[model samples]
Target: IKTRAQILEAASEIFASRGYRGASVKDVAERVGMTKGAVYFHFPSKESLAIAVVEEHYARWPAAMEEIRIQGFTPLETVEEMLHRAAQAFRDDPVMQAGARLQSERASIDAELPLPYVDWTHLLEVPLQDAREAGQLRAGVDPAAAARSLVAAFFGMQHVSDNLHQRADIMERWQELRELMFFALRA
Candidate 1:
């Protein structure tokens, strides 16, 4: 029997290349040198396989963020480091960059397809709220709004960098972005 790792690997490639609507079970099966039936035996449907691919990608960033939190960096530094790391990661993962672009394009039409729950804004709310309570953020700075801006900028940077083949020096750009965000948040 093919392992879950094999299935996920094949699915990741197909989803990243062909996207959720374009990719089919037959295509994935062909890539893996398996029959369509065999693919079905592993994942019941294309949506299931696509969700698995999305979830697999989603699983990575949070762990990295958790490590940053554990390192005891200040809130402002944490935000800067997270953005830099996130941008560098997107630059490194061509497949993920393309997948993110695809998701963004689709999200403009059918918002429910990608789902908002997977968004970083939603994920970062708790930490941001905690930071606010600790006075890490400026008084009256809305955690939700800040999270939204940060997440939006991240996706925007990824999309632009990937499409334009513009290799952003994330560390330098992050310094600018962080300064701007912090300056906006100051009393």
Candidate 2:
């Protein structure tokens, strides 16, 4: 990555490790042996840096949608693949973790960072609506409701796993979610 991107990444990891209030511009700069001036050259202050890091983290979701578009999977498969892939990504990515943290602390932050949950709900909604039309969902399963539930469930599961397991068991939790989803939605 380039200089700015590298700064954002290190800042993201630090923000993930320490909450926004706990992390500092100096810590972020020192992460890459960068001068605080270098960090400021890209970001004005700690708050600005935090906002950029959070924004940079959640920014890849549209590309994830595009990737789903090209996959040629069934609608149900699309929903599963999209969410499951996100589960894996969130489990492994510092940026995603930081974005999630920043979002949870949104009330504490000044700027309104993007909420991936909103995007996730819409992304899953489209495929779920299509899946219902394609007869992949059981009878009377409202696409919107199912979409909301799936997103909520994943969020809950991830939060619980983060608390209980440090996310090491995330993929396994996803397997359970996958099976539960099939049982709940399969036609």
Candidate 3:
């Protein structure tokens, strides 16, 4: 019934394992226990499938954060939880793993990929800006600038963990970065 969604899920698993250069439509189809024709009916092409994965990655965070918003945390708490939740997402979600792989391999991918981390930067920025205005952020800490650096630090931590031990240490690495980040930003 939800073949399109299932195809995207299977494609994420394949792309995460194989990257853009390594994954093929047949691989995704086989992983999903569907015919190649069935996969194609939803995605049309492998490039579209990769792009859709990237696009889905972009779509996921905001949706996650919106739910975070309703929990009534303070601005600083929001950003901290956001990063922790992101670490959890990376650990658990193959879609994000695939997106990271496809993003790094964008040069090999046939279509233009969405720019990585800009949305994430902005998402963090909004909450940090609120923190700054509320005097929760340390004096003179520029929310926009801190947000971008936080995004970079986060991605860098995850990328290293991904390479060294297949992300087994991501949450631990995240805790260290979280401490450093708060040391700089906490009032």
Candidate 4:
């Protein structure tokens, strides 16, 4: 119903800005103009709402990656565009922001949370392997290592950007990272 989406949207904003520990169901309910009970009915607990937001956040990636893949770019190019698109998504989407935050703050979450970075790392690794096979990757470059490094680099830049200026210049930092990393990876 309208209320469920509304509640989730409100929860996303709160969770993104305040983190999991700081966010409350009452705040989410207030943002959506609903009673706490109504919000609870849709999401049984704060942990449930947080998990829902995180799950929704991850749900957007597969389709987005497929869209990027269908464009016929080289595997290296595809990975670059993938990172750029994700940077844009993180900058523009509240759900992505909230999910990133929740993943970082997972220690505070009561439920068992999916491990972060592993999926993202693997997502890049496949394309990296293709790039290596295609001879687009530099000599001596290990696709698995490069993929893991990229995942770490991207998240690190995002974290620093968010901390320094609330991501006011994340795209700029991403471009810097992209150029530097690709230079090392490209043959």
- Tens-place lDDT digits, model 4, residues 15-106: 99998889999999888887888788899999899888988877777787789889888899989988998888789888889989999888
As for candidate 4, its clashing pairs are none
Model 3 Cα displacement at 7 (Å)?
0.7
lDDT of each: 0.67, 0.82, 0.89, 0.88
Question: Candidate 1, after superposition: displacement of residue 167 in Å?
Answer: 6.3
User: Could you tell me every candidate's TM-score relative to the true structure?
Assistant: 0.75, 0.89, 0.95, 0.91
Q: Is candidate 2 or candidate 3 better by lDDT?
A: 3
Q: What is the TM-score of candidate 4?
A: 0.91
Residue 124 CA displacement from its true place in model 4, Å? 1.2
Give me the runs in candidate 3 sitting further than 4 Å from their true place.
none
What candidate 2 gets wrong by more than 4 Å, as runs, is none
Across 1-187, the per-residue lDDT of candidate 3 in tens digits comes to 5467788999999899988888999998888888888788888988899999999987877777778889898888888898898888888899989999999887767777899989899888999999999999999999999999999999999999999989888999999988999899988
What's the lDDT for candidate 4? 0.88
lDDT for 47 (candidate 4) = 85
- lDDT (Cα, 0-100) at 112 in candidate 4: 65
**Clashes per model (N, Cα, C within 3 A):** 0, 0, 0, 0
The most accurate candidate by TM-score is: 3
Per residue, candidate 1 scores C-alpha lDDT tens digits across 2-112 of 776677777667665666667678888887778889888878887666655555566677787878889997666676677777777666654455346446556533323
Show model 4 residue runs off by greater than 4 Å: none
TM-score of 3: 0.95
Candidate 2, residues 1-187: lDDT per residue as tens digits?
2488788888888888887888889998888678888778888888788778777766677687678879788888878887788898779888888877877788987765676577678868988898899998899999999988898899888888887887889989989877987788989
Better of 1 and 3 by lDDT: 3
